[PDB]
Amino acid sequence: NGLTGTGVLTESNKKFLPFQQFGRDIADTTDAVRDPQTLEILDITPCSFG
Amino acid sequence: FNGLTVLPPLLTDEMIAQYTSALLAGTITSGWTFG
Amino acid sequence: SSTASALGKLQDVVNQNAQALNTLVKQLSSNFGAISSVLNDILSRLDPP
Numbered sequence A: 001n002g003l004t005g006t007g008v009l010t011e012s013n014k015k016f017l018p019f020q021q022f023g024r025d026i027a028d029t030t031d032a033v034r035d036p037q038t039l040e041i042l043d044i045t046p047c048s049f050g
Numbered sequence B: 001f002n003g004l005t006v007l008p009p010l011l012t013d014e015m016i017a018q019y020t021s022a023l024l025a026g027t028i029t030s031g032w033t034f035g
Numbered sequence C: 001s002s003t004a005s006a007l008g009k010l011q012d013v014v015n016q017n018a019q020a021l022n023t024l025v026k027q028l029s030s031n032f033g034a035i036s037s038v039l040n041d042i043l044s045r046l047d048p049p
């Protein structure tokens, strides 16, 4: 929905209020999104590097 | 993460505790002679 | 056992390191006088020049 980025998507057990769309924790890095079509909370994790 | 990595220390906590125990046992039993 | 804040030195070393990392990360959101703080939008919004 216009919020773009790379990473791996997993299932999440968080619980948004019925009006949020996505979440972030600290330093404003997105960590979870709600898909517009299923309305279930996903989870974002950067894919590995080192 | 954002290109940031944290590396683990070479010595683990158990090894540090083992040095501490060795030093303390030596100073209890021998004195300063083991230095 | 009871009295707290007796280990202020180690605690403040940890706090300083964490604060430095936190501000370094938060600096990524600054505009720096450009038109946006994200590369993808700038690339997708206007021409190379």
Ligand SMILES: *[C@@H]1O[C@H](CO)[C@@H](O[C@@H]2O[C@H](CO)[C@@H](O)[C@H](O)[C@H]2NC(C)=O)[C@H](O)[C@H]1NC(C)=O
Pocket: A036, A037, A038, A039
């Ligand atoms: C958007 O479209 C999807 C696809 O049809 C809808 O999801 C369906 O919802 C009904 C319930 O009303 C279920 O019985 C279907 O199994 C669902 N299909 C799929 C593929 O998930 C969805 O309800 C629509 N609306 C919204 C707001 O997402």
